[PDB]
Amino acid sequence: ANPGFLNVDRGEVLWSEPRGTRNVSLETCDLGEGPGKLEGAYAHLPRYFADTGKVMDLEQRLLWCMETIQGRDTKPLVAKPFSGPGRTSDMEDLVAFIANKSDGVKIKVALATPQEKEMYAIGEALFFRRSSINDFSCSTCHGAAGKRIRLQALPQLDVPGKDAQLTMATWPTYRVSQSALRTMQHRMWDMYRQMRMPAPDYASEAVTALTLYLTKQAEGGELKVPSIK
């Protein structure tokens, strides 16, 4: 029914698997919905975490847990966050699994503090921001309806409504043309890559700022994750 159900079941392993100097699993990792509780947590991500004092996506959160809870050496992961042929990504698998624990749920981020409203704003700004040799912005290709790049149609993401909901409901997803499950991080990387920008930092501020905007414009979208593309 979907080749992206490996990552689902590979992410299940790592969540169970004790690792690090402290050698515990991420079964007690808090994702916003309380410790251990996986249900709907991605449908409410990115969000503010009191234990750091900032807004955070799924990956920035996992990584935090790896550091403090597990004591896992995250440095090799922030370096190879996106899988290859013959090499998984324990950052794309734990996203598949955690995302699937939010399957059938509706996307529901909320601007509830000074940190989250500020983040969203800055993400709105980064969405419109023109820069570099091609002058592109995301809003250049997501700034209207019924438009397509070559043969592939474009989702409207500068407004609330259908396209956006459906988009964030179809991420993370499995792309066959790469035969790999991919996360919002990689998409953010791929799009800045093709905007002729420098390569954004994996799990950086800018990426997570964008995601919140995209996810807030996606409100109501009923997660069907991980998808086939």
From candidates 111, 141, 160, 204, binder to ligand HEC by CB under 6 A: 141
From candidates 53, 86, 149, 177, binder to other proteins by CB under 8 A: 149
Element (H, E) at 153: strand 152-153
CA distances from 38 to 42, 45, 176, 191 (A): 8, 12, 27, 29
Q: Does residue 201 touch other proteins according to CB under 8 A?
A: yes
Q: Does residue 120 touch ligand HEC according to CB under 6 A?
A: no
**Least distance from C-beta 114 to other proteins, angstroms?**
12
- CA torsion sign for 80, 86, 91, 96 is positive
Q: Does residue 76 touch other proteins according to CB under 8 A?
A: no
Q: Which residue has the tokens 């698997």?
A: 17
Pick 21 or 177: Cβ nearer other proteins: 177
**Least distance from C-beta 74 to ligand HEC, angstroms?**
24
**Least distance from C-beta 33 to ligand HEC, angstroms?**
23
Contact 131, 197 (CB under 8 A): yes
**Measured distance CA(109)–CA(111) in Å, rounded:** 7
Pick 37 or 229: Cβ nearer ligand HEC: 229
